[PDB]
Amino acid sequence: VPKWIQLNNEIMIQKDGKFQFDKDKEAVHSYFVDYINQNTVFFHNLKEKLDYLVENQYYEEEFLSLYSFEDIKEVFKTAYAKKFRFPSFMSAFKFYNDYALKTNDKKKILERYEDRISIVALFFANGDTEKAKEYVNLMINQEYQPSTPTFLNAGRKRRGELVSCFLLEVNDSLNDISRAIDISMQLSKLGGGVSLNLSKLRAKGEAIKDVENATKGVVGVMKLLDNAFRYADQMGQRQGSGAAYLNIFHRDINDFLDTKKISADEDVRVKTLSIGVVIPDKFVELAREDKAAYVFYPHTIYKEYGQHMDEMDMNEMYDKFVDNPRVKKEKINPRKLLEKLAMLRSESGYPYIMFQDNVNKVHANNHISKVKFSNLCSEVLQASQVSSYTDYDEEDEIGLDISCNLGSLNILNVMEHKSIEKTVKLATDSLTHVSETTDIRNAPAVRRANKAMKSIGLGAMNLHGYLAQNGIAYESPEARDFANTFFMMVNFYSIQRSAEIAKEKGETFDQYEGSTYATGEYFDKYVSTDFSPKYEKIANLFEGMHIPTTEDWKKLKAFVAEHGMYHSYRLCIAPTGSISYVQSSTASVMPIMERIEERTYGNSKTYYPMPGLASNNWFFYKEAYDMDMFKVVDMIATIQQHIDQGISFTLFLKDTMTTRDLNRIDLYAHHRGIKTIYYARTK
Amino acid sequence: VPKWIQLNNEIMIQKDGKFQFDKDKEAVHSYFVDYINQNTVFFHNLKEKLDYLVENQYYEEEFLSLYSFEDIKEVFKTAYAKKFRFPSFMSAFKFYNDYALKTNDKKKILERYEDRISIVALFFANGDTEKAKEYVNLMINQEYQPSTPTFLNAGRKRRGELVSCFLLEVNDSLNDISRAIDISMQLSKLGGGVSLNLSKLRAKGEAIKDVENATKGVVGVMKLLDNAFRYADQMGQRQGSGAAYLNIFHRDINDFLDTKKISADEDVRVKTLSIGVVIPDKFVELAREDKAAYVFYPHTIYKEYGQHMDEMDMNEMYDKFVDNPRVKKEKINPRKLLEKLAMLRSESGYPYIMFQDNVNKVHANNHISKVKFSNLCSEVLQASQVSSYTDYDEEDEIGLDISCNLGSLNILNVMEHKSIEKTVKLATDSLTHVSETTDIRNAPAVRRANKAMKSIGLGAMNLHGYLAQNGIAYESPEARDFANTFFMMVNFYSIQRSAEIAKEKGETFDQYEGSTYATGEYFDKYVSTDFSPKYEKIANLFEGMHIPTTEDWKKLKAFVAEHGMYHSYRLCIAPTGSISYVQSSTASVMPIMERIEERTYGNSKTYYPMPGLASNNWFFYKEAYDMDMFKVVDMIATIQQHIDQGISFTLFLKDTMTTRDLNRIDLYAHHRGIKTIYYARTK
Amino acid sequence: DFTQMFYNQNVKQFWLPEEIALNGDLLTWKYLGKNEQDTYMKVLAGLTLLDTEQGNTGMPIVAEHVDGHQRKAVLNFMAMMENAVHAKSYSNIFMTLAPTETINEVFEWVKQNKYLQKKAQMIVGLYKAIQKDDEISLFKAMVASVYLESFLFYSGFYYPLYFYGQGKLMQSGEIINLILRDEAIHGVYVGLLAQEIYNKQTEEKKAELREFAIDLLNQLYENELEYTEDLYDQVGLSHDVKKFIRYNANKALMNLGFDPYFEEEDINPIVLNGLKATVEPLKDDDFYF
Amino acid sequence: DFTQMFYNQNVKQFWLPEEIALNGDLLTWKYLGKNEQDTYMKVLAGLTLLDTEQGNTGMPIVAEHVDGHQRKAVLNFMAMMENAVHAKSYSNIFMTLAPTETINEVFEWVKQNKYLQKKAQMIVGLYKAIQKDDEISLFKAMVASVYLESFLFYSGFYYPLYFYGQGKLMQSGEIINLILRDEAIHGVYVGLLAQEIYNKQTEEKKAELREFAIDLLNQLYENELEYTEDLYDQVGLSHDVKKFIRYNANKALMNLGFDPYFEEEDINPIVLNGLKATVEPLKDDDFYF
Numbered sequence A, B: 001v002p003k004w005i006q007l008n009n010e011i012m013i014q015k016d017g018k019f020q021f022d023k024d025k026e027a028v029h030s031y032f033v034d035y036i037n038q039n040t041v042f043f044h045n046l047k048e049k050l051d052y053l054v055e056n057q058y059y060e061e062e063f064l065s066l067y068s069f070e071d072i073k074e075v076f077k078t079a080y081a082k083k084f085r086f087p088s089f090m091s092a093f094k095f096y097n098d099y100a101l102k103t104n105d106k107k108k109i110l111e112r113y114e115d116r117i118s119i120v121a122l123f124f125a126n127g128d129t130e131k132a133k134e135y136v137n138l139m140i141n142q143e144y145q146p147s148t149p150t151f152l153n154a155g156r157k158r159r160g161e162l163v164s165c166f167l168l169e170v171n172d173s174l175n176d177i178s179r180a181i182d183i184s185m186q187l188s189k190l191g192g193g194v195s196l197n198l199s200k201l202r203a204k205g206e207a208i209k210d211v212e213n214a215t216k217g218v219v220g221v222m223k224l225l226d227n228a229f230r231y232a233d234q235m236g237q238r239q240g241s242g243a244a245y246l247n248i249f250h251r252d253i254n255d256f257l258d259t260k261k262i263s264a265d266e267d268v269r270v271k272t273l274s275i276g277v278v279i280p281d282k283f284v285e286l287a288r289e290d291k292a293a294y295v296f297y298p299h300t301i302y303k304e305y306g307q308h309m310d311e312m313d314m315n316e317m318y319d320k321f322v323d324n325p326r327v328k329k330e331k332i333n334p335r336k337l338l339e340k341l342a343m344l345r346s347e348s349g350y351p352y353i354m355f356q357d358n359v360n361k362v363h364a365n366n367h368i369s370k371v372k373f374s375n376l377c378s379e380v381l382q383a384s385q386v387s388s389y390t391d392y393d394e395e396d397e398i399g400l401d402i403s404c405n406l407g408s409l410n411i412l413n414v415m416e417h418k419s420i421e422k423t424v425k426l427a428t429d430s431l432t433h434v435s436e437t438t439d440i441r442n443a444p445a446v447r448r449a450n451k452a453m454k455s456i457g458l459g460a461m462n463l464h465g466y467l468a469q470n471g472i473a474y475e476s477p478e479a480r481d482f483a484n485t486f487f488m489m490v491n492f493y494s495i496q497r498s499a500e501i502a503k504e505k506g507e508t509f510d511q512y513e514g515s516t517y518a519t520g521e522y523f524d525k526y527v528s529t530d531f532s533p534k535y536e537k538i539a540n541l542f543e544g545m546h547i548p549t550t551e552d553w554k555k556l557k558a559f560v561a562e563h564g565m566y567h568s569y570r571l572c573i574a575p576t577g578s579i580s581y582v583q584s585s586t587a588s589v590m591p592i593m594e595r596i597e598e599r600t601y602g603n604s605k606t607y608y609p610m611p612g613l614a615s616n617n618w619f620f621y622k623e624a625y626d627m628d629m630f631k632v633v634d635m636i637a638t639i640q641q642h643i644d645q646g647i648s649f650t651l652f653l654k655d656t657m658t659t660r661d662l663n664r665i666d667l668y669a670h671h672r673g674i675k676t677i678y679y680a681r682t683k
Numbered sequence C, D: 001d002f003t004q005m006f007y008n009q010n011v012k013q014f015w016l017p018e019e020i021a022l023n024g025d026l027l028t029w030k031y032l033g034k035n036e037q038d039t040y041m042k043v044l045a046g047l048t049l050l051d052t053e054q055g056n057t058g059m060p061i062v063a064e065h066v067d068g069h070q071r072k073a074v075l076n077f078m079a080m081m082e083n084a085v086h087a088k089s090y091s092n093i094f095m096t097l098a099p100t101e102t103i104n105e106v107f108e109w110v111k112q113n114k115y116l117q118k119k120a121q122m123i124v125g126l127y128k129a130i131q132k133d134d135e136i137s138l139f140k141a142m143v144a145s146v147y148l149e150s151f152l153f154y155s156g157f158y159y160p161l162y163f164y165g166q167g168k169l170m171q172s173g174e175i176i177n178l179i180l181r182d183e184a185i186h187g188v189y190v191g192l193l194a195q196e197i198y199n200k201q202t203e204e205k206k207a208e209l210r211e212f213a214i215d216l217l218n219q220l221y222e223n224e225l226e227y228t229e230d231l232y233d234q235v236g237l238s239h240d241v242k243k244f245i246r247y248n249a250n251k252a253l254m255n256l257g258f259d260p261y262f263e264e265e266d267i268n269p270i271v272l273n274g275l276k277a278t279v280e281p282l283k284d285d286d287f288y289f
Ligand SMILES: Cc1cn([C@H]2C[C@H](O)[C@@H](COP(=O)(O)OP(=O)(O)OP(=O)(O)O)O2)c(=O)[nH]c1=O
Pocket: A189, A231, A232, A233, A234, A235, B171, B172, B173, B174, B175, B177, B201, B202, B207, B208, B209, B210, B214, B215, B216, B217, B220
């Protein structure tokens, strides 16, 4: 048993009726002094280390050649000038086991935390020494954390893509289905999660060019995609993860849901394919009034109207579809479908729930397209256009497939540094750089949408950690007040930075002129409502920091009208799974699942108290399962009103909660404006 | 019970110790006058019939527009002047259930046998009235039978392709694997059977861009292809049929064979994918000497030598691969592998066995490529060049993927009419037309190889029927003498027709000048050895029909050298499954399995005596299971020496014989020059 | 003189329901009346109960008391077939044809059905009354087992066979025929063991054992009549099924070495219509010809 | 959470002795020394004798006391494999390698052997001590069963695997490998059933059951060391066999959800080469807030 593992295990040994939280500092100190400093390759000078890394196929010479070695040395000086110390053993362990650069035999350590941060900053700045130093200060202060792909792979020769979330539209054709399988395998090969919209595919028992009842439906494509993701398993390193989305009004919705039942047949069940259900307001209205609903065969609708069923507004088109004799449908019970959804989420956590009209009532790019589905993590909500992949000899009609770049603000560190504006703008610049430098050669729609939309996702994390370390309960109205003010400021400065980038480059995103940013409809609630804190305690948290006012929002609206907006999408709150340990932060804006995290690595068990947990703030670190999910919905809806994309919203349920309770949580989320629901986690 | 199937069941009622074979004539007469004439749509004149069929999307207007209606009327008169009568109930039942045109609701019958034959003939002739009449005479006399795709779809609007056998080479890349899956689904959608070579794919545990043990092997691609063929099943009426081929020296050969074991897990076993094993003479030599053989990792060989393993000569490079330290190899026992092959064929009928050096020592187009795999029916043996499907933005290097049009001579009717030459030439013309009118716009390599190679497959059937109806035992030397003379004559006239077509069109097949036809080496055994029958009984069977001598073969060799050959491949003997009933013929050149064949169609049981079966030739219709497989191998090898492609050779095994007997049959087939072994059928 | 041949026959008959694809019955099932589907579900549920107890209790307990490793191996194999193969196959059929609620309801129905509970009570009671080294209690349980194998299953088997014979539900019917083929050999085998014990007795004791067997048969028979009427009256077949169970009662008696008890009757002809390779190593001389 | 999965894995592993031809082993058997032939015979008889106890008592007694139809079916299947497949396989190996008189003498010797008897009777004692409706006594028997399946067999399996890894006695080695693969899954399955009982206990009762398991393991282990020296010293293998025993003891403990007892050791490379919360309807007013 390692000495640091023993020291970390002494946290649970209760001395004087309290956990020994101070043992984790001893644990991390022992871990470093006994393992990391021993296994860290040291070089006489930074020049020798850099030469070894570039020449041994560890780094990329292209981005490092943009600086004189003096500038790189000063950047590394800035990283090491902070004397950053990992507060807990788990932070250092996670970094040096997941993100630190190791030798080709994975025996020694080439990169410390400062080296990784310096390389990421030098890649972000793209030749600017002052910008690189600013990125170094931002990341070594741990105010901004680039996503796991960006943080892990930036500046590495043998790297995967810096983007890991992709959203593909699948057209109703064998050519398009085969192309979707190919692109899914190509993107999973790069290490990215792939989400596929299956709503355009015609249901089971539909006609294929005069041969009726010949289509296997969305479940055959689901099996194809599941095997494609199983094959493209990231070189046998990490299991290939993909998601499939289907509209709740699709005829195959029940077959779609039956793929996740525990009793599912092996010719129906899918293993590596997550499922998400898209629910328009029409379905919730039908279930509310207990009227019997209809699911429609998409190809009949396409033949009758020339438009896909998911391309049309179900609120206005549902009655026309039902009254159309040439549109094929079967009766369903919407309440029974809702209960089936809740039962499936209780049993397996699936499907994801995307409230279509909650997303699109505040969507800023409805002119480009409505948001029809989400990503594998249920936070990316962007307009997509389906591609028409024709025969081999013909020319394909390339659409827009969603792929956004992820980054997370550390709410605790941004708040303690009083640097919401600077951190938000620098994170926007880094995400923009990642977007520009991303070129995917086997997903033409993804590449086209990356070049045109220039969409980024700037998330946040350590919300519960910041609140509990400041004596604020997560469910308290003061917590929602802080979330309101903080994310209003984040949205303000992200919009300002996007407009500044548009002014600097003289270009906006494609089809910006039709957006609500161009017409000013986006800024209505910001030029009409004041989002300053309503509590003196919360207003004191923002001391020394200018909270944007209504006049500031009017000035921003005028600036955006004059100069445009560079990013179609800017903010999305991803789960931030493994980077939260490195940042000593609670995951995303979700509340903590456990106060102290018990995990086993190898044959030794490890203990991870939540960051900042102590005796004084023990009960402010309320576990998510002990919380009222209605108040968590209230918090996420408070945040969601300032996030243009969605938020990964996990439901934390007790074992005593019934199907009716899960349905009530889902319906209250729909009522409160929640866009997506990620997971149903039961204790 | 239907009257016709009641009459057909009176065959088995033994009267005076004999089967009532004449009941089948009464059975078919009742079948017609009680079902067919009642359910047949009859029009006032042929003009109304043709107008009705063209207008209601049953026929194609383009091919019928090349003839004035007087010519079409003359063709239909020629078809009906024969007054063809089906000799058995099964012939008419199979035709009117599988190939006769029916109304859109599958209610009534639009085409008789004469109508279908006339339409196929007018399609073949392509505007020529006299040629259409010649084709009508050829098919109404049942001397030549177009394959099931051609006979079923010739001249129909809503039709599949006229070719159903496709062979695909898969390169060792994810782009090429995705393209292989796409092309397999596209061709299965067209109704064709697709065979894929998986030898170029690197084995399990190979590196994918310097990360080791990353490749899932050929079994992952096998699962992908199996699900692709399950998806593209054409309503499931005829589910997607695929074949995978692996060289026996591939490292994944044991896992490739384990996909067919009964005890295989659901994560390994493939169900819709047939498997074939390509065995070079090196493997048979290694097993014969009981030496230690080695299977190789294909990617190591490709990296070391720059060529794929299956693109190299194993009999000359096996020792170099073994001695090469940079080539990765695994030790196997070749005799244990042979025993495993025999056990797998006994328990499942798989794999197909291709003797690669038996195919390539007589292959005429080794300059283009060596034959590396066979088709799903294990009789197409043509040169293929792998394609290089690149990224979306890059141009693809299109290779040569095999596909040939099938057609069978009826040996009994051809020999009765003394029309080997005319039947062979007309069948060659029809197959050439089918090749010219085929355009696969989603399989680039299939299209390119169809345009370049112009390969056709002209098979034969009713060999056992003809021999049994002429008092010749299938195993007798006289039967092999007849097969030798008959198929030498067929080869002579097919080569003559190919040379005449090349002379008329002024073009040969691509890379003809490097072929053995151009060098004249192909004709060595024909200008040196006389193939006239050695028995007076057989010599009288060919009386009235000129048998080409050595002088005739020398003249043909000069003609080919001076004019070239239009088809790279001309003759392949396919199984000819369902068209054998319509033609009242035994299936292919293989011996019959049952003298009287009992089948259940729906809830009706009906019996099919072999064509011409009686008491005077009961024992000449010896079942395939009761005869020596060594003599059947001798017969197939006698036929194979005149066939440029392979012969679908089914092994008929008793329950008593062990795996050693199956291995002995396989080794004797390899010794006797058998190119492929199709099935190990056990009774 | 017989165990080895029964061992070989039992192991060569080994099968799993998954070998038979059931989706082919979907349409002929859909087409049956509600009465027909109800009777069919209930019939198979009654069979499931019998096999559950034959596998859990009957065969293992008889195996425990019968001497000889080979006899025990046969009885253990038969026990496995009862609960690991037969009882499970019915769930494969149910899961294909019926929605979960109908499946739940039919299993609730077996628990509360008085005839099915009575027959289980009687048969299992005799199994659990076996006393170690007491051959008479063992004989009584073997008679009960033969009556379960060769008589009691048949009120259930009638209906799948009746459909199979009309070309309906033929995949389910194929499963049932395999089950029936097994039970026929199980009934013969247990019958032979029972006869062994019977043949050891005095004439006076034999007379009592025949009384036991006939009294038990009559008691089971009277209960089976009521069960048959309860299930089959709604499909109009009760009288036909009754003839079938009497036919099979005679076969059970014969398996026990006793004379037939019921007079012969004409059975529905529809129901009558309802009824690896050795590895040898390659030699060197095999490679030359 | 696990019985249907184990059902699947068990039935798909089904095999029969006849599938492997044994006669070709005589071509390597004739080349072994007397000590090698003696050790092999003694090891084989040891495995045979222990496996018979498992088929006649161990599996059927556990199947009897475990509640659940699906568990009883899996357990029945495992008992079948012991009696119908494994026992016939061991007999076949013996009949191939030794004449009748030699087989009878080896079994006489191993039947009297102190170390074989000690472990055989210790295990059987725990099976005989199971009491109706007492889950503690059932757990103790399950521990004994797991120790037999996952630990005690392995001092024996060592030798056939050792030959199998060298290219000697390949046909019987293939058979032994199939048997061993069955015992592995048997041990894992019974282990999960034991953990289910263990997890229903108080903390004090758990500590008491852990002490029982470790104490039993210690007794069996010390006897295994003596058993090992008694058989393997004459062929010079005891040191390596002891490492294999400890490695398999650790697997047995892990099957019972316990920590490994012995430090990790490398194994002989030749032997290695051989080797639903609650559904509630929405009752309206849940759509209004
Ligand atoms: C991407 C991928 C490839 N493979 C296998 C299948 C292909 O035959 C083989 C080649 O993959 P490639 O697509 O050629 O990968 P690569 O070009 O980046 O690697 P290399 O430089 O070695 O050519 O790798 C997998 O098994 N799983 C996977 O996820």
